[PDB]
Symmetry: D2
Subunit: 109 residues, 4 copies
């Protein structure tokens, strides 16, 4: 798999577990088409979203449902989600706080 | 002025100047409607985007054109832009500062919400 | 005033108020000598730490007491403090803003250096 | 090993390779005693710094030599190093830019 998503919780110092992640690809008609989705594991990682064959050149959006994550912990956060948009191994990492997030791409191989 | 945007450059240690910023509001048909826009100043700040009267409760998106900024500096970037999506909340008086710190392969955004 | 410190709270989305900040300068015997200190204001900013005349080229450490801040909010933190160590450089006129964004298990610090 | 250090480069979107890391422990006389050191690998990770037996309760400082890293890439950075100070699995992660860094602790098991 050429795409992995890793989510960390900066309040608890832990992986962010069971976070929903949705991936979209921009279609020829300029709309966002749903591409893949999943939930982070106990390690905060989401593997297997796609394959080398399916992950063609294009514009991709990774939407991380941070709001549901914080609300399940009792926290009303600022952001609706964390959005990562890029043109195409990619690791998309997100570090979450209730009123802040950071995202980093690590691109290897 | 209930909404300000501030952008910093983590490579040069400087305000990120002349960065395009677009604000959208989610419409009833679930599309994003352009709302306001501008360019960051020499202090990296964008003031005057909206008014207390216009900035009603709703879902907003602030799109920061980071890719064009890094292209102007000759540094290859990862992201097309930085997007900040939030629901505003008129429970008490509020001012929103959306702060973004930019690196070519990383950004962070923070909301500073004050009375 | 060539050196300012600004601290934000990523959990509450607010300036980090009443945070103790200590500045040190490296002495000839390689020890850290206290130089200046204060507490952040209601805007999360600490002004007036030093003067252009006092702030000569050297190695400085800015220590932000993040642990006491999180203890006051009742949130268990990881770090004892946030430390920012840098060499100042009087090649042209400069102002230094040391900005820190605090979470209980994470912080980021950025230098904004302007003419 | 109860302590791992991971360093990422936010300019290139890559692990930060061959970064020097020094660990100190505060002694009873209130001085910093050198505890362990190493260099990050091709994955940006530094494993094996210590053992469960050696990593007793105490105050630790992890000093990451970011200045040498940037200077080897032609960049004159702001910070002399990134310092992480904490009282005691710990993963200390640092994300580096020339005028900014972030550090996050991920504490598991």
């Amino acid at each position: 798999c050429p795409l992995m998503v890793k989510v960390l919780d900066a309040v608890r110092g832990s992986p962010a577990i069971n976070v929903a992640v949705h991936v979209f690809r921009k279609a020829a008609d300029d709309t966002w088409e749903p591409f893949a989705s999943g939930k982070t594991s106990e390690s905060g990682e989401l593997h297997g979203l796609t394959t080398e064959e399916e992950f063609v050149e294009g514009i991709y959006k990774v939407e991380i449902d941070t709001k549901s994550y914080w609300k399940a912990l009792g926290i009303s956060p600022f952001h609706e989600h964390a959005e990562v948009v890029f043109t195409s191994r990619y690791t998309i990492a997100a570090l979450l706080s209730p009123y802040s997030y950071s995202t980093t791409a690590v691109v290897t191989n």
